[PDB]
Design an enzyme around this catalytic site. Sequence first.
Site: not given
Ligand SMILES: [Mn+2]
Lengths: 288, 288
Positions: B150, B185-186, B209, B215, B244
């Site tokens: 990830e 998100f990242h 994800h 989030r 997530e």
């Molecule tokens: Mn994740």
Amino acid sequence: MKHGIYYAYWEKQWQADYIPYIEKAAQLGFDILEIAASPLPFYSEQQMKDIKACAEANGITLTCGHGPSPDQNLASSDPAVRAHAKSFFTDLLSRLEKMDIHVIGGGIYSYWPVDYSMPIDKPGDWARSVEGVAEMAKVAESCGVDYCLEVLNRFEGYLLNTAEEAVQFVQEVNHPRVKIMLDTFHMNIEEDSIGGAIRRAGQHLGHFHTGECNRRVPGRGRTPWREIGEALRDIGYTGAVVMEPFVRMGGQVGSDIKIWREMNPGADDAQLDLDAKNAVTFQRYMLD
Amino acid sequence: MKHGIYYAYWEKQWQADYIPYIEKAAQLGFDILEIAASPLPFYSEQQMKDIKACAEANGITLTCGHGPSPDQNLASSDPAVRAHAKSFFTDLLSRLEKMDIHVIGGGIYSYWPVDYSMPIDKPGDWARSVEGVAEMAKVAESCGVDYCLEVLNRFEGYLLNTAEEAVQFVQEVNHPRVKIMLDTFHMNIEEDSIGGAIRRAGQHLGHFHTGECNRRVPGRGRTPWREIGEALRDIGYTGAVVMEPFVRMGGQVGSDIKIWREMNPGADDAQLDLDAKNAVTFQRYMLD
Ligand SMILES: [Mn+2]
Ligand SMILES: [Mn+2]
């Protein structure tokens, strides 16, 4: 609006003589150079007049950012810290007056970077932070400084993470010198809506930081520039717009900012300077 | 593509009895429940059979997420830690095979949530990490498990922050079981381009994800869903899409995720259920 740039754009360490960077902002077409507060407590009375003189000589106004030390945490449950935090900020604000700076912004209701190896009590710290910032508002008024609380992503702060929280906070402070400061980089993580966040802040908005999602210069990222300029015009924002880009690996700057990759594959300082020159040309053209 | 949700949406610890969540994911329309790895080294042989049988009876496919403790850091300069990390992941991969789980994803090339107090040695940890992951890839192959690395924003990891970095890393590994895992998100923080990050990962993309910028569940924010569905389809991605979302304060989830406000003020678990059902409907609509 006036458009500025943080000095640490060129530094690898949180510390420099600011006069070279005042000149550099002038040649690159900025209206503002934003400086860190940490050296100011240790300035001579003449040292403050040096910087105020050079700033005025170049046509550049100075703003101030500060990430408080743990020893400066107005929210702390330790009385001795809250008393010192008040000591530091009271002395800082008076030196801001002598230097003729009218804006201080940052996590100045808490401390940066936060240490999460500790248990967090947000309601307890929140109340203490409001009381302490209320006391500092009186000082800010007497020195003529807008005390702007920066909303921060959850990795860098825990009290004020959304503009909505910032509004409730400054409403409880209830002092015209305590204003909201927003940052496109921090907003990009926490906010349901960028234009919506700016509109919530409204007349409370006293300072604005710009940067791309990964902290490149404005224009090299996915920041909604058109939406941002519409929202700032809707609320009649006349304050400063200070780009805070971090593109350089290495040093305490690269390490405190968590730059773990070269953001511009092998580019000279003349590339960065043009990158800034181009970025503020783009910023004015998107937000003015 | 199959569509999942992480169990920790409803839970405050990095573990829980997963069988009710298997049934709940089925009830709410999901294809997949993703589960934490932390309790699985301690499952009995009958437990593993019981949850495999439960997932099959409910038409649920199980995937596994893990954030490694410091004692499981494959990049560690300590050879005893690297050795324990390899023993840990070897035993976990065997247990995933016993549970008919074919995906593990997370920062399983480093450790999570990285403490940055220590001096970070990236070139060295990188080289150590590639070596350890290439050795785990052989275990991954024998247990039938995709080992998905990830990519994480700078505040939570330092080896892999962009898809471009993950490509270089997995090509160094050079084993079809070691794949890239992206996360909206990242990506939203680090990437210059959302679509360009996905197209860059391309054939190496093994897990995905989803989550809004702060989030929330998909569709409650500024995530460029249409651009993402386009890029996933352009690259022929047919793996899992697991949302997530993190919307509640407290315990070690709140603390590791840094959830400092209740995202849906006073929302019962029935409300979070409806939000997840609506979100996966939207997600299938945008991405399929
Ligand atoms: Mn994740
Ligand atoms: Mn800022």
